[PDB]
Design a binder for this molecule. Structure first.
Ligand SMILES: [Mn+2]
Ligand SMILES: [Mn+2]
Ligand SMILES: [Mn+2]
Length: 206
């Protein structure tokens, strides 16, 4: 199971990086991305806990970047980024100082060696036509993937998003957006991709 969107006490999650990696293994998550808001501070302690505890969990370094597009707050997740790259650190420092554009987020992620993901597209409450414009804009500026699967989701939304991703030659991501234990969100829960779209992890696995 891949869960490529989660938070820790480094941003607005309630669990430490150490508690989260253990929760992921208990939930039978095989690959976990930590994607804290505008910080990578949880990655190094999470890796340390996986090693010290002998966990069989692949940690994907990630971040969730806050952007603005056409006056809408839009979140872009970077996956498999190099968290020590000076441009990434500078960019995140500018983010916590203050937003930036979608294209600017994508460029920093790519320069850091990662893949850019349009996060939770259904949450922006856009009409079908404006969601299409957002996705077309994201793809036009070299975005790589879009989150297709979430924990709380009608089957219709998931297949609509997968078709929208495929339409623009984007890969699909999946993530719980876990912040704290609660009824409606759990690490790995109900995350799978429908047929007709490939997972974003292909872009670094091969
Ligand atoms: Mn959050
Ligand atoms: Mn978000
Ligand atoms: Mn999030």
């Amino acid at each position: 199971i891949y869960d490529l969107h989660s938070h820790t006490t480094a941003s607005d999650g309630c669990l430490t990086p150490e508690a989260l990696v253990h929760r992921a293994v208990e939930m039978r998550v095989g690959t976990l991305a930590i994607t804290d808001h505008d910080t990578t501070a949880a990655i190094a302690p999470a890796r340390e806990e996986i090693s010290r505890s002998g966990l069989a969990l692949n940690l994907i370094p990630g971040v969730e970047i806050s952007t603005v597009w056409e006056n809408h707050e839009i979140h872009i997740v970077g996956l498999n980024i190099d968290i020590t790259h000076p441009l990434m650190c500078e960019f995140l420092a500018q983010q916590t100082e203050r937003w930036c554009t979608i294209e600017q987020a994508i460029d920093v992620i790519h320069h850091s060696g990662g893949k850019a993901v349009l996060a939770h597209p259904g949450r922006y409450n856009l009409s079908a036509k404006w969601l299409k414009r957002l996705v077309a804009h994201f793809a036009e500026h070299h975005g790589d993937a879009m989150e297709v699967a979430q924990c709380q989701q009608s089957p219709n939304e998931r297949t609509q998003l997968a078709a929208l991703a495929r339409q623009h030659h984007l890969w699909a991501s999946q993530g719980s957006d876990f912040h704290q234990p609660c009824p409606w969100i759990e690490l790995g829960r109900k995350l799978w991709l429908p047929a007709g779209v490939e997972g974003v992890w292909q872009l670094w696995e091969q």
